[PDB]
A and B are shown apart, each in its own frame.
Chain A
Amino acid sequence: DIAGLTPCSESKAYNKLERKELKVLDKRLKQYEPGSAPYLALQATKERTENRFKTYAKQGLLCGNDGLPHLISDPGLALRFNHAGEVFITFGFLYVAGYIGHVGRQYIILSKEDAKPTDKEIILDVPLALKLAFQGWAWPLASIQELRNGSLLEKDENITVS
Chain B
Amino acid sequence: EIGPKRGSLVKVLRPESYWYNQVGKVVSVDQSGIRYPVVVRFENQNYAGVSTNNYALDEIEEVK
Contact = CB atoms under 8 A, between A and B. Distances in A.
A–B contact at 8 Å CB threshold (below): yes
B21 interface: yes
B22 interface: yes
Interface string A139-162: 000000000000000001111110
> What's the interface size class on B, roughly?
under 10
| Chain A residues touching B, range | under 10
A160 B12 CA distance: 13
A156 B22 CA distance: 10
A75 B21 CA distance: 45
Interface centre among A156, A157, A158 (most CB of B within 10 A): A157
Contacts of A156: 21
Contacts of A160: 20-21
A157 B61 CA distance: 13
Interface string B7-48: 000000000001111100000000000000000000000000
12 contacts: A156-B21, A157-B21, A157-B22, A158-B21, A159-B18, A159-B19, A159-B20, A159-B21, A159-B22, A160-B20, A160-B21, A161-B20
Interface of A: 156-161
